[PDB]
RNA sequence: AGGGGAGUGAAAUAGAACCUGAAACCGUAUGCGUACAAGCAGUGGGAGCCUACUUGUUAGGUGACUGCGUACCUUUUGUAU
């Protein structure tokens, strides 16, 4: 029983070349270069699922910092007061109130100052 | 009891492992032989 | 242990032959051994030794700029020999006499439990005529049946030689695979007793 | 009218009649659930800042469906060390609909 | 030479280098991007535009701007090397 590889080899190349769609040059039409691009794109995707959580937290902090100083308080003095009173709202929700519900953010900030911190 | 229904007891027949077929099989590349040396080559056998 | 006969009374057959356990892993081994023993191994390919030509170095060892080659009939090359070319061999296994007999004692017992063994008095047909055996088999109501007799008649073998799903066999010639393959099995009372004095 | 609730370890800003996907909840489709862990509720110009939980405030919602997110693919590769692994993942979620907010 | 019709045929994108007819490679057409911008060419975020339709918590194409990021194999104490 002789086995011919023509039919299963073609389906295996096509799976890789379909994931390499949109790449530049030989990275989307020759298998050797496209295989390495698909493997490398999967290393970055794994690693940037971690950075995505870091980059958004740094963005929320930088925006609470800007919003707190318009009310006369730094970011670090705000967080100390918030932990002091009882408040435990996220950084994700605090950054959302800073942009949109500015009148609600003001009440939270002056609550943190009233905690003498 | 049909010709497509009967089978052997579990543990009575194994698959035989073939070295040199990819990374996932645990026998790819060097095929369980280690790196260079005499006992990694064709006919590389040490006399009793 | 009672085996029902189609016209007479039950004939009180021995417990061991008809009515033992089903050793499934032993029937599998006896079936596999039978099929492996029925194939002829007649194939062959050619190694690099026995493909015609290729006795000289195509080019010198160094200086050309090409990879090193030693013959044109190399397994790497297009017309070269097969790396592990085949030779005729035999796929013949050993089965002990008592393992073979044990398997028949498992098939026979399991047929009685599946109600796919039919026992009748003497099965005889006069003159070799396929049309006449077709009529006689429908009185029993059988389509896909193996007929087992103490000694196969000449008239009975000549009829049903052309009939599609009907096979006529001897007691000592009935292989394990046939007793599983056919939908029903038909045995005479004399053929039952012959099984008793072989399988115990 | 909006509020802040806690579900699945995360916090959500929620207004009435809003669809959203949260972590899987052990509730069938169609039933009703109550979020008693309410950190903040606002109604226009009256905002009740929640010391840890607002006293008596709650949010009513109903389960719409269950499902799985899109597949993510995990590839673990260590170069020129003869190693590679692959995996797939779909995360379960629950979609709820907000039908009540009161402080 | 080669073609456009017309005829034959169930079918000529079965037309004689004639069954099926993939990939590398080379073109035409449409959509979006691209001439103040520095690097393994991707990914996290992300505007705008184009098309379709269940008319925007939807689907497909493109990807301005931006964080991170020196291919694969082998051989090595150790390679973007
Ligand atoms: Mg291949
Ligand atoms: Mg691209
Ligand atoms: Mg292409
Ligand atoms: Mg490999
Ligand atoms: Mg290993
Ligand atoms: Mg070993
Ligand atoms: Mg080696
Ligand atoms: Mg060594
Ligand atoms: Mg080596
Ligand atoms: Mg060694
Ligand atoms: Mg050495
Ligand atoms: Mg040798
Ligand atoms: Mg010759
Ligand atoms: Mg020779
Ligand atoms: Mg010679
Ligand atoms: Mg060859
Ligand atoms: Mg070849
Ligand atoms: Mg040949
Ligand atoms: Mg013998
Ligand atoms: Mg026949
Ligand atoms: Mg490498
Ligand atoms: Mg065609
Ligand atoms: Mg051609
Ligand atoms: Mg044909
Ligand atoms: Mg053709
Ligand atoms: Mg093509
Ligand atoms: Mg163009
Ligand atoms: Mg300038
Ligand atoms: Mg410009
Ligand atoms: Mg440049
Ligand atoms: Mg550059
Ligand atoms: Mg991007
Ligand atoms: Mg993205
Ligand atoms: Mg889109
Ligand atoms: Mg980028
Ligand atoms: Mg950079
Ligand atoms: Mg190499
Ligand atoms: Mg070296
Ligand atoms: Mg060195
Ligand atoms: Mg370099
Ligand atoms: Mg290099
Ligand atoms: Mg390095």
E strand or H helix that includes residue C168: strand C167-170
How many residues in chain D?
103
What tokens appear for B8 in the block?
């052997």
Domain ranges of chain D: 1-103
Residues C174 and C178: their CA atoms lie apart, in Å, by 7
DSSP for chain D reads -EEEEEETTEEEEEETT-EEEEE--S--TT-EEEE--EEEEEETTEEEE-SSS-SS-EEEEEEEEEEE---EEEEEEETTTTEEEEEEE--EEEEEEEEEEE-
Q: Are D and B neighbours with ≥3 CB pairs closer than 8 A?
A: yes
Which pairs count as long-range contacts for C81-86, CB under 8 Å and 24+ apart, including other chains? C81/C45, C81/C46, C81/C47, C81/C48, C81/C49, C81/C50, C81/C51, C82/C45, C82/C46, C82/C47, C83/C47, C85/C44, C85/C45, C85/C46, C85/C47, C85/C50, C86/C43, C86/C44, C86/C45
Q: What's the sign of the alpha-carbon dihedral C101, C105, C106, C112? A: positive
Residues C124 and A3: their CA atoms lie apart, in Å, by 51
DSSP for C19-45 reads S----HHHHHHHHHHHHHTT-------
Are C181 and B3 within 8 A, CB to CB?
A: yes
Q: In the beta sheet, which residues pair with residue D60?
A: D34, D100
- Touching subunits of C (3+ CB pairs, under 8 Å) are B
- Phi-psi bin for C127: left (phi > 0), alpha (psi -120 to 50), beta? left
Residue with tokens 């959302």: A96
Burial track B13-42 (b if 16+ CB lie within 10 A, e otherwise): eeeeeeeeeeeeeebeeeeeeeeeeeeeee
How many residues in chain C?
200
Smallest Cα–Cα separation from D96: which of D41, D24, D39? D24
Are B6 and C31 within 8 A, CB to CB?
A: yes
Smallest Cα–Cα separation from C186: which of C154, C147, C155, C151? C147
Q: Are C and D neighbours with ≥3 CB pairs closer than 8 A?
A: no
Q: Is A63 exposed, middle or buried (0-12, 13-18, 19+ CB in 10 A)?
A: middle
Q: Chain B contact for D82, CB < 8 A?
A: yes
Residue with tokens 């009374």: C9
DSSP for C56-125 reads S-SS-SSSSSS---S-SS-TTSTT---TT------------HHHHHHHHHHHHHHHHHTT-EEEES----
3-state helix/strand/coil string of A20-44: CCCCCHHHHCCHHHHHHHHHHHHHH
Which nucleotide lies closest to A25 by the C1' atom and the CA atom? E41
CA of D83, C1' of E40: distance in angstroms: 21
Residues D97 and D21: their CA atoms lie apart, in Å, by 9
φ, ψ dihedrals at C123, nearest 5°: -105, 105
Dihedral of the alpha carbons of A58, A60, A61, A64, in degrees to the nearest 10: 160
Say whether C147 sits in a helix, a strand or coil: strand
Residues D40 and A104: their CA atoms lie apart, in Å, by 10
User: Is residue C124 within 8 Å of C156, Cβ to Cβ?
Assistant: yes
CA of A99, C1' of E11: distance in angstroms: 69
**Residues in chain B within 8 Å Cβ distance of D83:** 23
Residues C39 and C42: their CA atoms lie apart, in Å, by 9
Sequence-ordered list of residues with C-beta below 8 angstroms from that of C27, at least 6 positions apart, any chain: B1, B6, C103, C106, C107, C176, C180
Say whether C165 sits in a helix, a strand or coil: coil
Smallest Cα–Cα separation from D35: which of D65, D67, D3? D3
Smallest Cα–Cα separation from A31: which of A10, A43, A11, A16? A16
Are B3 and C31 within 8 A, CB to CB?
A: yes
Are A42 and D13 within 8 A, CB to CB?
A: no
What tokens appear for C22 in the block?
């089903």
């Amino acid at each position: 029983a002789r086995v011919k590889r023509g039919v299963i080899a073609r389906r295996r190349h096509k799976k890789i070349l379909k994931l390499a769609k949109g790449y530049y040059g030989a990275r989307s039409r020759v298998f050797r270069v496209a295989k390495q691009a698909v493997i490398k794109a999967g290393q970055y995707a794994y690693r940037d699922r971690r950075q995505r959580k870091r980059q958004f937290r740094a963005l929320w902090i930088a925006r609470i910092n800007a919003g707190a100083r318009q009310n006369g308080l730094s970011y670090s003095r705000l967080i100390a007061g918030l932990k002091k009173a009882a408040i435990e709202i996220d950084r994700k929700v605090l950054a959302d109130l800073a942009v949109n519900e500015k009148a609600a953010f003001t009440a939270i900030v002056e609550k943190a100052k009233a905690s003498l911190a | 009891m049909q010709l497509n229904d009967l089978r052997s007891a579990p543990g009575a027949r194994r698959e035989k492992h073939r070295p040199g077929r990819g990374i996932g099989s645990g026998l790819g590349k060097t095929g369980g032989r280690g790196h260079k040396g005499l006992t990694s080559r064709s006919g590389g056998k040490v006399a009793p | 242990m009672q085996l029902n006969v189609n016209g007479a009374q039950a004939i009180e057959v021995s417990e061991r032959t008809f009515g033992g356990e089903f050793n499934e892993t032993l029937v599998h081994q006896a079936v596999v051994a039978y099929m492996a023993g029925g194939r002829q191994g007649s194939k062959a390919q050619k190694t690099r030794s026995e493909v015609s030509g290729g006795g000289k170095k195509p080019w010198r060892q160094k200086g050309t700029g090409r990879a090193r080659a030693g013959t044109i009939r190399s397994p790497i090359w297009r017309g070269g020999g097969t790396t592990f070319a085949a030779k005729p061999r035999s796929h013949e296994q050993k089965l002990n006499k008592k393992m073979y007999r044990a398997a028949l004692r498992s098939i026979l017992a399991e047929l009685v439990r599946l109600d796919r063994l039919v026992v009748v008095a003497d099965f005889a047909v006069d003159a070799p005529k396929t049309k006449g055996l077709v009529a006689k088999l429908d009185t029993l109501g059988l389509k896909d049946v193996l007929i087992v007799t103490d000694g196969v008649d000449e008239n009975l073998y000549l009829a049903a030689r052309n009939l599609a799903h009907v096979d006529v066999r001897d007691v000592q010639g009935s292989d394990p695979v046939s007793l599983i393959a056919y939908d029903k099995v038909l045995v005479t009372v004399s053929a039952v007793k012959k099984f008793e004095e072989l399988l115990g | 009218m909006y509020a802040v609730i806690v579900t699945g370890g995360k916090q959500h800003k929620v207004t009435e009649g809003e669809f959203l996907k949260v972590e899987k909840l052990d509730v069938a489709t169609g039933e009703a659930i109550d979020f008693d862990r309410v950190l903040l509720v606002a109604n226009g110009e009256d905002v009740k800042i929640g010391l840890p939980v607002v006293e008596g405030a709650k949010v009513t919602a109903e389960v719409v469906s269950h499902g799985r997110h899109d597949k993510v693919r995990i590839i673990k590769f260590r170069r020129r060390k003869h190693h590679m692994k692959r995996q797939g993942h779909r995360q379960w979620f629950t979609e709820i609909k907000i039908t009540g907010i009161q402080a």
